Structures are given as C-alpha cells and as structure tokens.
Amino acid sequence: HHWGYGKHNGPEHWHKDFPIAKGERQSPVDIDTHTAKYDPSLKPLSVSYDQATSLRILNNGHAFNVEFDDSQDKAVLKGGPLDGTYRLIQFHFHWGSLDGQGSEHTVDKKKYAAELHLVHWNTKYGDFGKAVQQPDGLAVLGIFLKVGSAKPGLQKVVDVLDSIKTKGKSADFTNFDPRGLLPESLDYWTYPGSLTTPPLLECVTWIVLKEPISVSSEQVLKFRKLNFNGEGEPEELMVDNWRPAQPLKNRQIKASFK
Numbered sequence: 001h002h003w004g005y006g007k008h009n010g011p012e013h014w015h016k017d018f019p020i021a022k023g024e025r026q027s028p029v030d031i032d033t034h035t036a037k038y039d040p041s042l043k044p045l046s047v048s049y050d051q052a053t054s055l056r057i058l059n060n061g062h063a064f065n066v067e068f069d070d071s072q073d074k075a076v077l078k079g080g081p082l083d084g085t086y087r088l089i090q091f092h093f094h095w096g097s098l099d100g101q102g103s104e105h106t107v108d109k110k111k112y113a114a115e116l117h118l119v120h121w122n123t124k125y126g127d128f129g130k131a132v133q134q135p136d137g138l139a140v141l142g143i144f145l146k147v148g149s150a151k152p153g154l155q156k157v158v159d160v161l162d163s164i165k166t167k168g169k170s171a172d173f174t175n176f177d178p179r180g181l182l183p184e185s186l187d188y189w190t191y192p193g194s195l196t197t198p199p200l201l202e203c204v205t206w207i208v209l210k211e212p213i214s215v216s217s218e219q220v221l222k223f224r225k226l227n228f229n230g231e232g233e234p235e236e237l238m239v240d241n242w243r244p245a246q247p248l249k250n251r252q253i254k255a256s257f258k
C-alpha cells in the first residue's frame with residue numbers, strides 16, 4: 001500500500017509514513033504576487049545547459065524522469081538566491097486530467113495545466129543522496145505550462161512516451177537539449193521548501209519562473225496517456241500527479257523583478 005495520488009494513498013495520507021509532510025518548509029505553496037517582495041540583492045540567475053548530456057527517460061510510476069549525466073559539471077544552475085554550483089540530474093513534470101489543474105505551485109491561487117521541474121544538486125555535498133540531507137542541497141527550477149501553441153522543444157519528449165507507457169519502463173534518450181523548454185524571461189520567485197513527493201525532504205531552494213511556456217493540447221494529451229500501473233495491470237491513467245499548496249508558515253517569497 002505505497003504512496004501515490006489516489007483517494008486511498010494521495011497527498012492527504014502521506015503524513016502517516018512521512019510525518020515531515022506537516023513540517024515547517026513544505027512545498028508547493030501558493031505564490032501571492034502582491035505579498036512577494038522584490039529583493040534587489042538577488043544575484044543574476046545563470047542557467048548553463050550548453051553541455052547537458054541527457055541519457056534516459058524513465059516512467060517511475062509517479063511521473064517520467066529525463067535523466068542527465070551528472071558525473072561532471074556539465075549542465076549547472078548558479079546565481080539568483082544560490083551559493084555555489086548546482087548540477088542538473090533530471091527533469092520531470094506534474095500535470096492534470098484537465099487543462100484547469102496540474103501545477104503544484106499556484107499564482108494568486110491560479111493552477112496551470114502542468115509544471116516542469118529541473119532538479120539540481122549542490123556539488124559541495126559530492127552526491128545527490130548526500131545533498132538531499134542538507135537544507136541547501138537541491139535547487140529546483142519550476143516552469144509553468146499553459147495550453148495554447150505547441151512547444152517545439154517538447155515534442156521529442158512527447159514522441160517517446162509511447163515507449164515508456166507503464167511503471168518501470170525506460171528508453172534511451174540521448175542528445176535532448178533542455179534549453180528548448182525555457183521561456184524567454186528568467187524572472188522568478190524564490191523560497192525555501194521541500195520535495196513535493198515522499199520523502200518530502202526539506203532540502204530545496206525553489207526558483208519558480210514567472211513566465212509560463214505554452215504547450216499544445218495534443219502535447220499534454222500525450223502526457224495523460226501514460227500509466228501509473230505496471231505492464232499488464234489494470235490501466236490507471238497517469239494524471240493529477242500534483243501535490244496541492246501547503247501552508248507558507250514562517251516563510252517569505254522573494255521576487256527577482258519589480
């Protein structure tokens with residue numbers, strides 16, 4: 001009886017196995033745009049993905065992960081609120097059954113159709129497993145998706161999903177350039193938070209971009225054909241794999257922009 005996104009094992013249940021679910025820096029949160037304060041001190045954000053090496057795409061039963069070679073400083077995130085260098089390890093998405101839900105963060109209580117998470121780990125801790133035990137171990141770049149025009153840089157991801165329909169399936173996924181998933185502006189909000197799935201560790205500096213990317217209805221419909229289940233099991237469509245907003249508690253959300 002594992003965690004998931006159903007009535008019986010969904011976010012309102014996670015606290016029983018993972019009591020930090022009710023902790024002091026849980027994610028996601030609602031971003032109240034009128035309460036977020038411009039922080040003139042935030043350093044410029046640096047997204048350096050030119051040398052990124054994608055390797056594989058995996059359906060893990062909760063989402064699909066595009067995995068990178070993180071055995072050297074190829075693809076790194078620096079600057080903004082960050083001290084030091086954070087190495088890209090994977091990206092994934094969270095999405096809805098309908099276009100009116102799917103994001104984990106909200107903006108003035110608005111839900112987007114989906115949310116992209118680019119996961120990076122602080123290289124001063126040596127490996128990802130050590131980094132997640134630290135309060136500044138990870139930096140997650142979050143990007144909202146709205147439905148409208150296609151995102152050409154997403155289509156290579158969309159077209160492989162048929163080959164990883166069910167939990168535990170993977171496929172080779174080399175030479176994918178995650179720069180094609182970014183919006184034009186790097187204006188962001190930032191706050192200290194957590195993983196949004198078990199084990200809900202409080203190790204993340206969240207960096208959520210203000211500008212959403214546009215994807216087509218056909219692109220997101222292909223995300224919604226994935227399965228939570230394993231091969232041969234009763235089909236359970238992989239939809240609504242998002243955690244709702246958590247209490248902000250004793251935190252301030254900072255804006256990079258006026």
Ligand SMILES: NS(=O)(=O)N1CCc2ccccc21
Nearest residue numbers: 117119138140194195196197
């Ligand atoms: N949104 S999420 O919590 O699933 N996420 C962000 C940080 C991280 C680390 C390892 C695996 C996944 C992720």
Ligand SMILES: [Zn+2]
Nearest residue numbers: 092094117196
């Ligand atoms: Zn995520």
